[PDB]
Amino acid sequence: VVWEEVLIMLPDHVSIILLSATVPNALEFADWIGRLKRRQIYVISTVTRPVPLE
Amino acid sequence: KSEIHLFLQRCLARLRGSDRQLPQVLHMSELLNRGLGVHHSGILPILKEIVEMLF
Amino acid sequence: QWAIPVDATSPVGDFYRLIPQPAFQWAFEPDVFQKQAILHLERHDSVFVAAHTSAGKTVVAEYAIALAQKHMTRTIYTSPIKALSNQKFRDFRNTFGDV
Amino acid sequence: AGPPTLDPVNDLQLKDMSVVEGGLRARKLEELIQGAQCVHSPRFPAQYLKLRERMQIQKEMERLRFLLSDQSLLLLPEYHQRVEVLRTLGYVDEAGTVKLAGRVACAMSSHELLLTELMFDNALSTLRPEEIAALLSGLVCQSPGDAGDQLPNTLKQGIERVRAVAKRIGEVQVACGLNQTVEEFVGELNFGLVEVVYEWARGMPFSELAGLSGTPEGLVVRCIQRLAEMCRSLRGAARLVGEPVLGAKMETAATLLRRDIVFAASLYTQ
Amino acid sequence: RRGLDPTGTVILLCKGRVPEMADLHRMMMGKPSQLQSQFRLTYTMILNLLRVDALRVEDMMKRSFSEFPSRKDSKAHEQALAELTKRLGALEEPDMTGQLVDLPEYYS
Amino acid sequence: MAMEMRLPVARKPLSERLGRDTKKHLVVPGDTITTDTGFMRGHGTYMGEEKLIASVAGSVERVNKLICVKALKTRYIGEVGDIVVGRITEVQQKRWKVETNSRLDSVLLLSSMNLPGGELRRRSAEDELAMRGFLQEGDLISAEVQAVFSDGAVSLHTRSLKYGKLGQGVLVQVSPSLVKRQKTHFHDLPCGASVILGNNGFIWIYPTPEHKGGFIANLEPVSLADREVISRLRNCIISLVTQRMMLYDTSILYCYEASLPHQIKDILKPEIMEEIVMETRQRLLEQEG
C-alpha cells in the first residue's frame, strides 16, 4: 500500500522511471500509470541475460 | 590481514573508549580477522557497514 | 493509449548522430536497451524497464542523476531495503557531487 | 398437462424452509393466474412483450448507474464501520467535523488511539521522567515479553493501567462492524524491553547492560530511536492542550535519552 | 556482474530430507506472480485526510489499483447508460386500461 | 436628503426580549474550580495550592479528565490545517510578514509559494530579486497554516490552486469567535457573489469568477448588478455579526432573502437589524426545529 498511496498522491509534473526486474504483467501496470496521469509512458524489456548461471 | 587491521583501525577508533570495547564488536572483528562475517539487522549499523565495506 | 512497448530492434538506428553534445560517459560500452532508454529520457519521457542484470538498469538511473545537475533540479532514489539504500549513496559519493 | 412431478419437499425429503415457502408461493401464483383477466383480451401478447422490453431496458440503465456508483466500492462499508468507531470515541462529532480530541491524534506518529486516551485518562502524567520513558517502550519494543519480579512495586501496577485502556478500546473496536478480535488487539502490546531501557535512561554504562540483558544489542538502539520520536511528538500535544506538567517531563526525558553511541551511525559522517 | 566473472553457481543445500521436487519445479521453472493489489485502510490514512481537505477517502478508494479491472471502461459505461436511457423515450406506453389492468401483475 | 440626527436611547439590560436561563457553569478569575484527586489544567486556568483556579471569565468545558475555561473574547490562535486570510506588512530578504490578528506576526516563506509560471522550471536565487516585486506591501492573500513554532508563531503556506493573491472585492473584519467550524470554508452562494470565511475573522467577498493565484489582473469595471449583491451581503454580515450571530452559509443565505423588501441604503438603523435578525432567528427555529 505504501507504493500505491505515493503514486496516486504524486503530482503530474514529475517524470517517473520505474525499474522492476522482469515482472510478467508490466504492459498494463504502466497503462494504469499512464491513465491515472495525463502522461505517456514507454516500456522496455530484454532477454538473454548475460553471465549464464546454473 | 594488514589491510583488514588498518581499515578496521581507521573505522572502529572514532568513538569513546567505553563503547570501543564491547562483546559484539570484538566477537565480530575477531571472526573478521579470519575472513568471516555475519550480517543481519540485529547488529549495530556501524558494524553493519564494515562488513559490506570489506566485501 | 498511454502505453507503447518499443520494439527491441526497430527504433534504434543511430545513437551518436543525435544528441550532438556529450553525456555521462561510461568506461565500457552501452547496450542497445540503455541507449534506447537514453534516447527517450532526453525528451523528459517516462520510462519502464524490465531486465535481469542489476547494475545494467542503473545506467539510465545515473544518466538522470547526472542530468539533474545540468538542470539544477533534485532527484529522489528509493530503495526498499537498508543494505542497498546506502550502497548507491557510497557509489555516487566518491563518483561525483553530494548525495 | 404434464406428468406427475416429484415433490421438492416431501418426495426428496428436502426440509428447507425456503424450498417449502417457494413451493407454496408457486402454487398460489398458479391459482391466481388461473383467474387472470388480461389473457382473454384482444392484444395481451404484444403489450406483454412491450412491457417485458421496457422492464429489460429499465434494468439495464439502473444496472449501469449502479456500476458508475459509489456504493460499488468493496471496503466502503468497512470505511463506515471504521468511522463509527472513530465517532463513538469523542474525536469526530457529526458529519466531518473534528473535535479537539480528534486534533491531538492527527499530530502523532503511531498508536494514536491508545496514546491519546492515555494522554487524557491520567495514568502516566504523574510520574518521573525516567519512568515514563520506560512504559512508552512497550508500544515499540518488538520483542517477546517476560517481565521481572524484582521491578518496583509501582511498575507491576503501571502495566495494567494501560492494559485496561486496551480492554476499553477493544470492546468499542469489536462491536462496531470490525472483524478484529479484542484479545488480539491487546496481544500487540508486549513489555520485553521495559527494565533494560530504565537503567539505560538512568545513566548506567552499556558494558554490563548488554551482558545482563538477554537480547542482542542491535535492536535496542533502534527501539531507542523509535521511542525518542514519540517522546518528541508528545510535546506538541501537551502544548496543544496547554498542560506543561507533562510537557516538562517529556522535555526532561528527551534530554535524558540522547547519548553519543546512538549518533555514531556510519564512518564518513562528516 | 556485467561479465566480470567467468560464470556463477547457485547451490541448493538440503540437509534434513528429500525436498519434494514437485514444488522445486513449481518455484524454479515458473513465471512470476501477477502484480496484484493489497490496498487496505488504517486509522492513519483517515486521520491525515480528515484535517486537511483537498482529497477524499473515496477518491483514493476509486483511484486505486484494486478497482482497475472495473473502472477501466467507465466512460463507455456512462455512454451506454445515456444511449439506453435515450432508447427509453422511444417506447410507447403499453396499454394498462380495460381488461389489461392485470397485465403488470401477470408479468410479475 | 434630510440628514437625520437622532438621540441616544437607553439600553434594555438582562436580554429580557426572549428570556432564557443558562444551565452551564460560569466562573470569574479567582474562583476555585473542582479540586478532586487528579485533573489536568486547560487553557484559561492555572494552579495554586491544591486548587484549580480559573484565570479568565467564561464557562468550564471538560472532556473526561480536563478542566478548562473558554473565554468569550480572545485573539486568533493558530492550528495545523486552518484556513486564514492576512495582509503583507513587511517584505524581507527571504520571507514576508503577514498580520492575521494574532499575538505575533505570521511568516510566509519563499520556499512555499506558487511563483509565476505555475510549473516546474527552476527555483534559485535569481527569483529572490523579483520576489519582493509582486507580493508587495499591503496585498491580500489567502493561505493555510503549515506548522506551529516554539513561541506561538505560525508559518503558512500556499501550496494549492485555490490559494494565492486575491483580487477585487471588500473585506470585513470581525472577532475570531463568531465563525462556526466546518469542513468547507469556501462558498459559492447562489446570489451573484462568493465569500471566504477566514477562521481568523477576515471575511472576503468577491464576485463569482465568471467561467471555470494573482496571475490575472482583471482590473476592468464590474457590472452594476454585482455591486448591489456585494453591498447587500456586506450589510447583512454586519447585521448578523453585531448582535450575536455566528456566521456560516445558511445564516447569511437566510438573512439575504429576508432583506429584499426594502432598500440597501436604508438598513443602518438600530431597529431594522433587530427585525431582520429576529426573522432569521425564527426561520432557523422553524427549520431546525
Side-chain angles (χ1 to χ4, degrees):
Chain A
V1 71
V2 183
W3 278 260
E4 314 174 345
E5 294 168 4
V6 166
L7 281 154
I8 313 161
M9 284 151 51
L10 184 63
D12 308 345
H13 79 102
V14 56
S15 283
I16 62 186
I17 310 162
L18 300 94
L19 304 173
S20 84
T22 306
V23 289
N25 50 2
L27 265 71
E28 84 266 20
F29 192 100
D31 202 22
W32 173 86
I33 298 170
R35 204 166 311 196
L36 198 77
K37 324 289 198 184
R38 297 295 155 259
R39 196 50 186 77
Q40 197 175 188
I41 196 167
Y42 297 86
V43 192
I44 306 173
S45 83
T46 62
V47 291
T48 77
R49 169 203 199 267
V51 293
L53 74 171
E54 307 95 327
Chain B
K1 285 196 182 93
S2 70
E3 282 296 331
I4 290 172
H5 189 273
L6 71 91
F7 169 78
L8 185 136
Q9 194 56 41
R10 58 183 294 237
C11 295
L12 279 189
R14 68 161 302 192
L15 53 85
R16 66 181 181 179
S18 174
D19 290 331
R20 189 62 169 76
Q21 297 86 18
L22 192 152
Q24 179 196 184
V25 74
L26 70 92
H27 198 73
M28 183 179 72
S29 54
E30 167 160 303
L31 267 295
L32 267 166
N33 164 57
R34 295 198 277 264
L36 308 188
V38 192
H39 194 319
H40 52 76
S41 69
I43 63 172
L44 216 58
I46 183 64
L47 278 300
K48 258 156 65 181
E49 83 168 1
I50 279 183
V51 192
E52 56 206 5
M53 283 303 218
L54 284 171
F55 197 84
Chain C
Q1 203 198 28
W2 317 118
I4 296 90
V6 287
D7 189 358
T9 313
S10 297
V12 59
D14 54 351
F15 180 50
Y16 313 89
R17 311 270 82 87
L18 272 166
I19 305 97
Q21 68 276 309
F24 175 84
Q25 314 167 26
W26 303 268
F28 54 91
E29 75 297 333
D31 202 73
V32 295
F33 80 106
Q34 305 181 356
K35 304 177 269 199
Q36 264 178 326
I38 283 156
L39 299 161
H40 271 74
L41 186 139
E42 197 67 32
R43 288 169 273 147
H44 214 281
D45 264 329
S46 303
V47 175
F48 199 100
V49 166
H52 321 285
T53 181
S54 307
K57 290 168 297 225
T58 71
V59 164
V60 64
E62 55 185 18
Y63 195 104
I65 293 182
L67 194 144
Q69 306 319 307
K70 311 302 190 305
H71 291 191
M72 285 73 74
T73 47
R74 306 183 210 243
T75 61
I76 305 304
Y77 195 88
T78 74
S79 300
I81 184 73
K82 199 172 293 180
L84 179 73
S85 299
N86 55 35
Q87 180 178 218
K88 304 274 177 280
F89 156 73
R90 170 162 68 258
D91 209 43
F92 295 142
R93 178 54 157 240
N94 284 305
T95 299
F96 49 72
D98 54 354
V99 190
Chain D
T5 55
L6 61 84
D7 197 347
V9 178
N10 301 276
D11 291 331
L12 283 179
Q13 311 186 352
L14 313 180
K15 285 192 178 177
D16 311 281
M17 283 193 177
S18 71
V19 179
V20 193
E21 291 156 326
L24 292 175
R25 180 71 161 166
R27 281 86 170 94
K28 183 198 170 188
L29 295 188
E30 298 144 4
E31 299 152 1
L32 303 177
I33 288 172
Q34 292 203 8
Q37 287 194 25
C38 74
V39 180
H40 299 295
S41 65
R43 73 281 191 191
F44 161 69
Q47 320 292 288
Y48 196 57
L49 281 148
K50 288 201 67 153
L51 194 155
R52 285 183 61 252
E53 198 168 357
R54 205 177 179 91
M55 293 315 78
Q56 284 95 22
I57 289 187
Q58 176 168 1
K59 186 165 166 62
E60 297 161 285
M61 75 290 291
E62 54 89 19
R63 196 190 61 80
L64 268 297
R65 45 188 37 80
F66 174 86
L67 272 184
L68 197 74
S69 290
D70 304 280
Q71 320 310 307
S72 176
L73 287 183
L74 169 60
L75 285 171
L76 204 80
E78 278 303 320
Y79 162 74
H80 286 313
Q81 291 149 342
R82 270 203 182 283
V83 164
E84 297 321 303
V85 66
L86 204 71
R87 181 190 300 239
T88 300
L89 305 186
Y91 293 5
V92 181
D93 54 26
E94 291 291 357
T97 299
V98 55
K99 289 205 188 211
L100 180 76
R103 285 190 294 258
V104 165
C106 280
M108 313 267 295
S109 76
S110 76
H111 318 82
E112 304 93 342
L113 280 189
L114 195 45
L115 208 52
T116 64
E117 312 290 352
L118 283 165
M119 175 155 196
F120 289 178
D121 182 275
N122 210 358
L124 60 86
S125 313
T126 55
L127 287 173
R128 290 175 63 243
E130 68 180 2
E131 185 33 63
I132 53 176
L135 267 181
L136 285 196
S137 68
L139 274 66
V140 302
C141 75
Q142 190 88 340
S143 73
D146 48 337
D149 291 330
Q150 59 276 351
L151 283 181
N153 52 358
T154 189
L155 293 179
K156 326 300 303 203
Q157 163 191 357
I159 57 159
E160 71 269 18
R161 49 204 295 175
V162 68
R163 289 174 69 68
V165 191
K167 302 143 196 177
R168 217 171 78 194
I169 313 293
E171 278 65 12
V172 68
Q173 267 287 99
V174 297
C176 201
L178 271 298
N179 221 349
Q180 192 265 334
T181 318
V182 54
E183 182 43 50
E184 58 190 2
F185 193 95
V186 191
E188 288 170 359
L189 262 70
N190 61 5
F191 296 113
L193 283 183
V194 63
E195 63 257 51
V196 176
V197 68
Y198 186 80
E199 292 91 6
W200 185 79
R202 180 186 258 173
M204 187 180 282
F206 202 90
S207 296
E208 63 253 39
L209 190 142
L212 188 153
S213 48
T215 185
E217 57 278 14
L219 58 85
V220 174
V221 60
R222 175 89 190 120
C223 167
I224 285 300
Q225 297 186 175
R226 282 206 68 71
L227 192 147
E229 160 63 38
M230 73 166 44
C231 293
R232 200 199 326 286
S233 193
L234 262 62
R235 305 275 322 288
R239 167 165 57 164
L240 190 74
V241 162
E243 191 260 332
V245 189
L246 176 86
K249 46 190 51 61
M250 289 304 103
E251 204 158 9
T252 47
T255 79
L256 177 137
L257 288 177
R258 296 167 81 214
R259 281 192 176 180
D260 314 284
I261 178 57
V262 165
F263 285 163
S266 171
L267 177 62
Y268 45 96
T269 65
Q270 65 183 358
Chain E
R1 167 49 208 148
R2 202 181 169 271
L4 292 93
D5 265 348
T7 53
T9 315
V10 185
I11 294 92
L12 164 64
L13 187 148
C14 56
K15 52 188 281 188
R17 202 164 58 193
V18 65
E20 283 91 6
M21 65 169 317
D23 47 50
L24 272 77
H25 160 269
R26 187 175 50 185
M27 182 181 72
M28 294 185 165
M29 201 95 88
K31 69 160 286 181
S33 288
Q34 301 293 86
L35 274 166
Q36 307 285 107
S37 44
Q38 280 82 15
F39 194 97
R40 66 185 196 168
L41 269 299
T42 48
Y43 292 115
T44 295
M45 185 181 290
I46 297 169
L47 268 177
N48 299 341
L49 299 154
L50 208 68
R51 181 50 170 176
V52 67
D53 43 2
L55 300 93
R56 297 181 61 248
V57 194
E58 280 78 355
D59 280 317
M60 183 158 296
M61 274 278 268
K62 66 173 79 163
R63 285 223 295 265
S64 81
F65 201 81
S66 48
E67 321 286 344
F68 187 54
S70 83
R71 269 183 161 72
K72 189 176 145 39
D73 293 347
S74 294
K75 284 185 289 183
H77 273 153
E78 69 270 14
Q79 198 65 40
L81 181 150
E83 303 317 316
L84 285 182
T85 300
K86 178 255 185 183
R87 277 189 60 247
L88 176 71
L91 294 193
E92 282 191 341
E93 203 273 302
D95 196 19
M96 296 300 103
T97 63
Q99 197 179 357
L100 289 172
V101 164
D102 54 316
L103 180 69
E105 177 76 351
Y106 199 90
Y107 164 90
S108 79
Chain F
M1 201 41 48
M3 186 179 288
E4 163 169 42
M5 295 182 286
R6 68 160 61 227
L7 212 66
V9 60
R11 293 131 290 184
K12 171 181 191 178
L14 292 166
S15 280
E16 319 171 11
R17 34 202 190 253
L18 308 156
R20 274 302 173 267
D21 288 347
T22 318
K23 324 296 209 309
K24 298 194 241 156
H25 184 185
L26 269 58
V27 287
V28 288
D31 274 340
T32 81
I33 312 171
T34 292
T35 46
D36 281 5
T37 62
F39 269 86
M40 293 183 182
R41 65 181 294 273
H43 278 130
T45 73
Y46 75 91
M47 184 278 288
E49 170 52 86
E50 63 177 1
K51 275 189 318 192
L52 270 75
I53 307 183
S55 78
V56 69
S59 65
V60 189
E61 287 156 345
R62 169 148 78 209
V63 186
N64 66 6
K65 198 57 66 71
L66 192 74
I67 296 185
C68 82
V69 170
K70 186 261 290 179
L72 61 83
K73 273 176 69 68
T74 44
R75 293 170 90 79
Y76 179 83
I77 312 300
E79 271 189 347
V80 194
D82 207 2
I83 282 293
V84 311
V85 178
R87 187 184 301 263
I88 297 90
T89 60
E90 292 180 354
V91 63
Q92 293 220 280
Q93 195 77 71
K94 296 179 181 103
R95 65 174 54 85
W96 298 271
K97 308 283 289 178
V98 189
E99 193 262 335
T100 54
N101 273 321
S102 46
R103 326 210 294 280
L104 276 170
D105 263 358
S106 54
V107 174
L108 172 71
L109 275 190
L110 159 69
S111 309
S112 312
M113 180 46 169
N114 265 28
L115 275 165
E119 59 97 21
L120 170 80
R121 40 156 296 266
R122 205 180 36 247
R123 296 200 80 182
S124 296
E126 65 265 352
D127 308 300
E128 193 163 30
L129 262 64
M131 72 84 88
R132 308 175 283 179
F134 75 109
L135 272 176
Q136 62 156 357
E137 297 278 349
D139 276 2
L140 294 174
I141 72 151
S142 78
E144 163 200 339
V145 168
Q146 196 175 288
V148 174
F149 277 4
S150 49
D151 53 351
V154 286
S155 186
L156 73 165
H157 77 73
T158 305
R159 268 189 296 265
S160 83
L161 266 297
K162 314 179 66 53
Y163 308 160
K165 163 153 70 164
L166 301 164
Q168 307 192 30
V170 300
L171 188 75
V172 167
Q173 322 192 19
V174 309
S175 188
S177 64
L178 306 194
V179 181
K180 190 175 178 64
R181 265 198 162 284
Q182 282 179 356
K183 50 181 167 173
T184 61
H185 286 107
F186 274 81
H187 292 301
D188 204 335
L189 313 188
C191 317
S194 306
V195 74
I196 311 178
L197 307 194
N199 199 338
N200 64 338
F202 281 69
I203 297 300
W204 176 245
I205 304 149
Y206 58 105
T208 79
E210 197 55 41
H211 44 291
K212 281 176 50 179
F215 314 94
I216 297 89
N218 186 354
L219 312 185
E220 285 84 356
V222 177
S223 45
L224 180 49
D226 283 317
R227 291 182 178 91
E228 305 191 1
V229 185
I230 309 170
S231 301
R232 281 213 172 258
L233 295 156
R234 187 256 200 276
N235 282 356
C236 291
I237 284 169
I238 300 299
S239 70
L240 287 70
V241 76
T242 292
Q243 308 286 325
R244 192 262 292 177
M245 316 271 296
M246 295 215 81
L247 294 91
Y248 70 91
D249 49 354
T250 76
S251 68
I252 318 177
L253 289 174
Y254 277 7
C255 176
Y256 176 76
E257 305 294 331
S259 158
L260 276 296
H262 61 279
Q263 275 174 4
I264 79 182
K265 162 191 163 52
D266 289 331
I267 55 171
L268 284 175
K269 307 188 201 289
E271 71 279 19
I272 315 292
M273 319 313 157
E274 278 283 340
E275 66 182 1
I276 302 161
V277 67
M278 290 314 78
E279 165 150 349
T280 311
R281 173 67 99 199
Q282 73 185 4
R283 193 187 265 236
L284 293 173
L285 179 136
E286 62 86 20
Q287 177 260 0
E288 190 271 332

